């Protein structure tokens, strides 16, 4: 049959970037023509493969990673990039073989009062490995003395909310990202 690409892209809601979701896609015929012939995508870069020339290629597994970040932070979803998203949330390998798809979702993920469903990781001791996922909520110890799970000075919660408002600029508006991986 056909691959469930419509479930991931046209999903009702997307995950936070720190808790980025992964759906394994296999045992199906992928019709990539639905994707690269769509004028609704704002960002569409492929690394190591040509977009139009994928219907004649086969792969053992295809992974779809979805989340939501700021518009300014979309540039970090690329090999060899640095920043809070690439370092502490979603890291792509330097030898990444896949495509990155993103589109503006201010009409869906932004709330007037302030959304609470989309978060990002702010503090972490070290950069993530490629395709690593860290959903831990341990109190980040920034000072010399320990925190024993209590907030305060030099004891900050490692996650921070975006608070997408519709009046924000396009750089601060939410963008739904879907990363396709091949092997």
């Amino acid at each position, epitope marked *: 049959n056909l691959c469930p690409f419509g*479930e991931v892209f046209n*999903a*009702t809601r997307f*995950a936070s970037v720190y808790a980025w979701n992964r759906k394994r896609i296999s045992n199906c015929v992928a019709d990539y023509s639905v994707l690269y012939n769509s004028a609704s995508f704002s960002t569409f870069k492929c690394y190591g493969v040509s977009p139009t020339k994928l219907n004649d290629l086969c792969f053992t597994n295809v992974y779809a990673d979805s989340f939501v970040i700021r518009g300014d932070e979309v540039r970090q979803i690329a090999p060899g990039q640095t920043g809070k998203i690439a370092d502490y949330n979603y890291k792509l390998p330097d030898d990444f073989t896949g495509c990155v798809i993103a589109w503006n979702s201010n009409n869906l993920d932004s709330k007037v009062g302030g959304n609470y469903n989309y978060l990002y990781r702010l503090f972490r001791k070290s950069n993530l490995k490629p395709f690593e996922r860290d959903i831990s*909520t341990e109190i980040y110890q920034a000072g010399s003395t320990p925190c024993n799970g209590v907030e305060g000075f030099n004891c900050y919660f490692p996650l921070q909310s975006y608070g997408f408002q519709p009046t924000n600029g396009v750089g601060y508006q939410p963008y739904r990202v879907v990363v396709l991986s091949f092997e």
Partner: antibody, heavy 127, light 109 residues
Framework: QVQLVESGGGLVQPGRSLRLSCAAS????????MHWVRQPPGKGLEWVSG????????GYADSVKGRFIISRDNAKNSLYLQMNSLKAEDTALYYC????????????????????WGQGTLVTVSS | SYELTQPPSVSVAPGQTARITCGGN??????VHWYQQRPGQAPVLVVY???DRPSGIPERFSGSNSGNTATLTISRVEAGDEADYYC???????????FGGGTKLTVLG
């Protein structure tokens, strides 16, 4: 063949933190939405939070919004609920349930309801 | 903040039919689900999507939904039917799952 084991509950001091976990087994975990519903002793059911098949946070109770953070790991067939700045009104028996249906289902379905329910883990907020 | 209202208590003699209402603003526009909870047990779905039953539920349980009042109708009430019952809908405006206050069904006689 379809159970939801829960742990992490216990005694916690007012203001501290506590992380609950809900393990799933015997069904495709990355296909259904998962929810947390708590219940104080003798009181009614209060929906805490939920998360869709694609780990999308889907609202919170007004009393827990901003303090609770729910997440899931489909690779481990598990669901988590981080609870910060706990107060005495958080003392309740927290359940874990799955939902058939649409919106937050893997496809365009209707609304099957909260199918199976776990036995719950008791959280006591006291000094 | 959508709010559901169920009667706190309902009493029905054995063999008769019980009606448990679930009020709400345009609740007929939403899918209503009902749950039974026995003392010390976990909730169990009995009615979903206004009027559907899971496998293993006797045909004695039925549900309706119209306008601003959804109703759970259970016919031929047995003593074992004595438990608590909650209704639940989905509040798309506030992105929140809402439960009712609960109805303690007590079987007389």
């Amino acid at each position: 063949q379809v159970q939801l084991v829960e742990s992490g509950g216990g005694l916690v001091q007012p203001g501290r933190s506590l992380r609950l976990s809900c393990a799933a087994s015997g069904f495709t975990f990355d296909d259904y939405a998962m929810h947390w519903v708590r219940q104080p002793p003798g009181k009614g059911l209060e929906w805490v939070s939920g998360v869709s098949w694609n780990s999308g946070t889907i609202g919170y109770a007004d009393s827990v919004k901003g303090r609770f953070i729910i997440s899931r790991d489909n690779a481990k067939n598990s669901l988590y609920l981080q609870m910060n700045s706990l107060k005495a009104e958080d003392t309740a028996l927290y359940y874990c349930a799955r939902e058939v249906g649409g919106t937050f289902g893997v496809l365009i379905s209707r609304e099957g309801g909260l199918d199976y329910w776990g036995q719950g883990t008791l959280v006591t907020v006291s000094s | 903040s959508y709010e559901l209202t169920q009667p706190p208590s309902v009493s029905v003699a054995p063999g008769q039919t019980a009606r448990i209402t679930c009020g709400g603003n345009t609740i007929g526009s939403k899918s209503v689900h009902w749950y039974q909870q026995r003392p010390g047990q976990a909730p169990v779905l009995v009615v979903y999507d206004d009027s559907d039953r899971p496998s293993g539920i006797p045909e004695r349980f039925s549900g309706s939904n119209s306008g601003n009042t959804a109703t759970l109708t259970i016919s031929r009430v047995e003593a074992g039917d004595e438990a608590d019952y909650y209704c639940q809908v989905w509040d798309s405006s506030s992105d929140r799952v809402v439960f009712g206050g609960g109805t303690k069904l007590t079987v007389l006689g």
